[model samples]
Structure formats: structure tokens, C-alpha cells
Target: MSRPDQAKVTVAKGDIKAIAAALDMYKLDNFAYPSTQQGLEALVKKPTGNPQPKNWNKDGYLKKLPVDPWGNPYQYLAPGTKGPFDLYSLGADGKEGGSDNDADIGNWDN
Candidate 1:
């Protein structure tokens, strides 16, 4: 792969790891991951709905949510079939599945 392409992958992975850590902290305070409907936005803003978090960090966990290196918003699922939460980027193609540079970068794999 070209250097620029590799850098994108690296940045995606790093973003995922950082976001995952923030989610963990969110869970620690709230006792559960944000609901699927609430999505990752809850990490940057207090969610207001059923199962609302009581101890949501006032300043938010992530200062800002990051988009994938491909400029697509990262996908997030709570109560995921594969795990408590499934976080991933759809990769360069911005599709569900692909190979090579387009392969998804997911928390399960990380």
C-alpha cells in the first residue's frame, strides 16, 4: 500500500482506540454503554431519552467525535451481537464490507 493509504488506516485505528477508551469511561460512570439509538453522539453530549445516563460527564467524554479517515462518520452499535458495542469504520469505500484498503476496521478485530 502507498504511504498515504497506510496512514489513513493507522489514523482510523488510532481513532477507534481512543473512542473505545472514552466509551469505557462513559460506561464506568453510567453503568452501561449508550443505547444504539443514542449512538456515539452520547459520548460528546448528554443523551436525553429512556435509560438516560445519570452521571454523564458534564464536559463529555470526547471533545469531538471523529469521522473515519475516508471522511465517513464511524459506525457505532451498542448491545452489538458481536459484543457490548461494535465500533468500526466502513473503510475507504464507505460500504459495509470490502477487501484491502476498503476492509472495515472494527473494534472486534482490534
Candidate 2:
């Protein structure tokens, strides 16, 4: 793999780990994960949609969200395939699944 290709995976890993921590903290105050509709944007702004948060942080969970290495928004699921939530990058192809760089880089793996 070229330097950039290998770096992409590692960069994605760090981004989601940071996201995962922020989500966990968000859940602590709100008592439930944001709906998939609210998505990861809930971390940057208090969600105004369904299942509104009663105890959201005024400081916000994150100042902003990171774009995945592939130039795609990271995928988030509230009631996810592997757990209560799944956060992942779509990888180099920016699609659902494939080999190596095209494979999903997800929080579930770690």
C-alpha cells in the first residue's frame, strides 16, 4: 500500500475513537443515544428532532465532526448492527463493503 492509503485507515480509526468517547459522554447526560436521524451532528449541536435531549451539555459534545478519510461522512447507527451504536467510515470506496481499504472501518472492530 502507498503511504497515503495506509495512513487513511489509521486516521479513520482515531477519528471514530474520538467520536465514540463523545457519544458515550453524550449518553451520560441525555440517557439515550441520539436517533439515527439526529446522527453524529448531535455531538456538535443539540438535536431538535424526535426524542429530544433533556440534559444535553451546553458546551456541546464536539466542536465539529470529522469527515472520514474517503471524503464521506462517517456512518452512525443508534440501534446498530453490532451494538447500541455503530460509527464507521465507508473506507476508500466510500461504499458499504469490500476488501481492505474499501472495507468498513468501524467502531465495532475495536
Candidate 3:
């Protein structure tokens, strides 16, 4: 079967911003950024060594963690060279490499 063309759906810059904000909030609560393995999940639940907030809201930072335009979870890396964190959506194809959609969004771009 042919693979889906996820690049047709582009992950917006706003989503990247949201991810960054969420990461910042996670850091504020946990005092450290997320690891590559933990990725964006860290924002939803506290990762090992990362404390869960005593007064965290049910919605937390985001009502729900957003996936990329392709319906894939955004990619994250801590201690990111791009910024405090690196946030990206795999575009429409859910694979890497493309100009508008497949490209990785990062703090360096801004």
C-alpha cells in the first residue's frame, strides 16, 4: 500500500510556539527540560526525576498535547541547540525532508 502523504498538511508555526510554551511551563515546574526519549510527554506527566506538580491543573499547560499536522506527535529534544528546547512536527508525510511541510521547525529558525 502507498504511504500517506503527510506533507500535504503542514504543521503550523503556532503549534511550534505552543510546544515551546508547554516545554517552558514544564521546566518551570520541573526545573529541567525534557529528554529526547521522554519528548513532549514530559509536559503531560512528570518523567522520572521530574516531579509532578502538587497543584497542577487537569488541563495542565495545554488542554491536550497537539500532534503534528500529519497526526504524529511533535519531535522534542532537551538542552536544544535551537533554544531551551527543540520542537518540530514531521509535516504531512510523517517523514523528514521537505521545504514547507517536511521541514523541522526550531528556535534557530526564529
Best by lDDT: 1
In terms of lDDT, model 3 sits at 0.53
* Predictions in order: lDDT: 0.64, 0.63, 0.53
Taking the tens digit of each residue's C-alpha lDDT, what string does model 2 give over 1-110?
44667688877777787767766767765666765556456655666554444456422343255577767776665544546577777878767786678878867422
Candidate 1 backbone collisions, by pair: none
Consecutive 10-residue window with the lowest summed lDDT within model 2? 57-66
- Among all windows of 10 consecutive residues in model 1, the one with the lowest summed lDDT is 54-63
**Per-model TM-score on C-alpha atoms:** 0.69, 0.67, 0.60
Model 1: CA > 4 A from native? 38-45, 49-65, 108-110
lDDT by residue for model 3 (45-65), tens: 555574657443222244254
* Candidates ranked by TM-score: 1, 2, 3
Predicted candidate 1 versus true structure: per-residue lDDT over 28-83, tens digit per residue: 76667776657456655676554344456532343265567777776666655646
* lDDT measured at residue 64 in model 2 versus the true structure, 0 to 100: 55
**Global fold similarity of model 3 (TM-score):** 0.60
